[PDB]
Amino acid sequence: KNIKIMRLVTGEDIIGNISESQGLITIKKAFVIIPMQLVLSPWQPYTDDKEIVIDDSKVITITSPKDDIIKSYESHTRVLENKQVEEILRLEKEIEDLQRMKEQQELSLTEASLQKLQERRDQELRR
Amino acid sequence: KNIKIMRLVTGEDIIGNISESQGLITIKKAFVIIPMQLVLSPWQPYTDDKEIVIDDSKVITITSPKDDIIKSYESHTRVLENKQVEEILRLEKEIEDLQRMKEQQELSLTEASLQKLQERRDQELRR
Amino acid sequence: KNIKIMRLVTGEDIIGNISESQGLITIKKAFVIIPMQLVLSPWQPYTDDKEIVIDDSKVITITSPKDDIIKSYESHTRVLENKQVEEILRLEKEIEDLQRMKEQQELSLTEASLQKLQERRDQELRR
Amino acid sequence: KNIKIMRLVTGEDIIGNISESQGLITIKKAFVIIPMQLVLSPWQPYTDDKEIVIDDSKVITITSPKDDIIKSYESHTRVLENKQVEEILRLEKEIEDLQRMKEQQELSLTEASLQKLQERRDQELRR
Numbered sequence: 001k002n003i004k005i006m007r008l009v010t011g012e013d014i015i016g017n018i019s020e021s022q023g024l025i026t027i028k029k030a031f032v033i034i035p036m037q038l039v040l041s042p043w044q045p046y047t048d049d050k051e052i053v054i055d056d057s058k059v060i061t062i063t064s065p066k067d068d069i070i071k072s073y074e075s076h077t078r079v080l081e082n083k084q085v086e087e088i089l090r091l092e093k094e095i096e097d098l099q100r101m102k103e104q105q106e107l108s109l110t111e112a113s114l115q116k117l118q119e120r121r122d123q124e125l126r127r
Numbered sequence: 128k129n130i131k132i133m134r135l136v137t138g139e140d141i142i143g144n145i146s147e148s149q150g151l152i153t154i155k156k157a158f159v160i161i162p163m164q165l166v167l168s169p170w171q172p173y174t175d176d177k178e179i180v181i182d183d184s185k186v187i188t189i190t191s192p193k194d195d196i197i198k199s200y201e202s203h204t205r206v207l208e209n210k211q212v213e214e215i216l217r218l219e220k221e222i223e224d225l226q227r228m229k230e231q232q233e234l235s236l237t238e239a240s241l242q243k244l245q246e247r248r249d250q251e252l253r254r
Numbered sequence: 255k256n257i258k259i260m261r262l263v264t265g266e267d268i269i270g271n272i273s274e275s276q277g278l279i280t281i282k283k284a285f286v287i288i289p290m291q292l293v294l295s296p297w298q299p300y301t302d303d304k305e306i307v308i309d310d311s312k313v314i315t316i317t318s319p320k321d322d323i324i325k326s327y328e329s330h331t332r333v334l335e336n337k338q339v340e341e342i343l344r345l346e347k348e349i350e351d352l353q354r355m356k357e358q359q360e361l362s363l364t365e366a367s368l369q370k371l372q373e374r375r376d377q378e379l380r381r
Numbered sequence: 382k383n384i385k386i387m388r389l390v391t392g393e394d395i396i397g398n399i400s401e402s403q404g405l406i407t408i409k410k411a412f413v414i415i416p417m418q419l420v421l422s423p424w425q426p427y428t429d430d431k432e433i434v435i436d437d438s439k440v441i442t443i444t445s446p447k448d449d450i451i452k453s454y455e456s457h458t459r460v461l462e463n464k465q466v467e468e469i470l471r472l473e474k475e476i477e478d479l480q481r482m483k484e485q486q487e488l489s490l491t492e493a494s495l496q497k498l499q500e501r502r503d504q505e506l507r508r
Contacts (some may be wrong), residue, residue: 009390025227043132047444047445047446048234048448049238057438081237084236085244089251091229098221098225102218105214105215108175113208120212120216136263171315171317176318181314185263
């Protein structure tokens with residue numbers, strides 16, 4: 001782990017775990033810092049990648065943060081990850097309940113109703 | 128098919144497909160008739176059975192309905208069955224969409240996040 | 255366990271654990287169903303019996319309930335039983351506290367006061 | 382097909398089909414992403430080219446989008462293309478109708494009127 005802040009040519013403060021191999025650097029868990037108390041925001045809300053590759057020519061300065069900023073960053077990312085996993089569990093429970101309720105509702109149909117169900121299911125499958 | 132109306136000792140008009148084998152009669156798709164234009168309502172909304180067995184000592188009279196009542200009954204049951212099958216299809220589509228969205232959300236998690244996910248999934252499974 | 259709904263000639267819906275031995279049927283944990291959401295009420299609040307014997311000539315129809323009704327019935331009876339056992343524990347604690355307080359108050363009496371206490375206790379015992 | 386989002390030094394988010402051959406990259410169907418729900422806008426409304434060539438030194442980061450963004454992008458481009466082809470058909474119908482109406486109006490002219498028509502048509506042709 002190596003948490004560092006960088007300043008971009010655009011004028012943004014990015015805090016994240018960086019690796020500087022051969023000029024092309026790799027960033028994990030990048031967060032935009034916005035003052036007002038520090039406010040951490042996601043850098044790229046339009047992707048699901050983890051290792052973001054950026055050239056060193058686009059970063060102005062690369063500094064090491066203080067202890068309070070590191071603590072706040074770790075707490076924020078931990079809270080976000082816990083919220084994500086809790087949402088995953090909630091989704092699993094909801095889909096299980098919906099599946100069981102749909103199965104119970106389907107159990108009370110006549111045989112010709114299952115015939116029509118299949119005669120529309122194949123149409124929905126082909127289209 | 129043998130659609131017939133009966134009057135119960137309670138004072139209810141039940142229209143349905145009946146079979147009179149040995150005194151104990153069997154009813155399929157029973158509907159309560161309520162005047163005001165005829166209004167057809169479900170007889171037993173607290174069960175999923177199809178063949179309801181009732182003794183002949185609890186029915187007052189057993190008559191054959193006219194053509195308009197039979198037409199209205201067939202139309203009503205057809206509309207109800209179509210609504211049920213459409214609801215089944217809607218439920219299937221909704222659960223498929225929810226499953227796909229949950230899978231996409233889960234795909235963006237770190238390995239230790241899957242570790243914690245399993246360490247809570249086993250707890251939810253045992254309890 | 256065999257949970258079933260029945261309709262009575264009076265016009266009541268009774269959900270409970272039934273046994274049909276020789277026409278005379280036995281009911282355990284009978285509950286009256288009242289619509290409005292289902293509302294479960296005690297059938298016989300004027301007795302403490304468990305096995306209620308009723309003849310098959312007084313029941314109109316005997317159907318099997320759906321899964322949601324069974325779940326609601328089990329939850330309701332479990333909540334009622336937990337409330338009853340909690341009330342039993344509360345009563346035990348209250349009577350223990352009252353006994354201890356009465357003993358402490360009685361400990362501070364003179365011997366002639368115990369004499370008069372007995373000379374009225376025997377009168378209360380004979381009457 | 383390779384749909385990807387990029388961030389420019391200007392501070393713009395461009396989603397499109399990119400090809401990275403030798404540093405000079407080629408973009409097809411570039412769209413500017415504007416948040417508020419994602420809003421897709423044309424990147425270059427002042428040209429009709431398809432393959433836009435841009436150097437890698439002008440792009441900050443190059444990420445892969447999620448599934449929802451790809452779905453929205455495909456739907457948006459399909460709707461735009463359908464609107465364009467429908468407009469082409471409407472234009473063809475309108476010009477055909479105008480041609481037929483002009484021909485019908487011209488059919489009702491005297492020979493000297495066609496003489497004057499030509500004596501002005503040649504003037505309009507030379508000028």
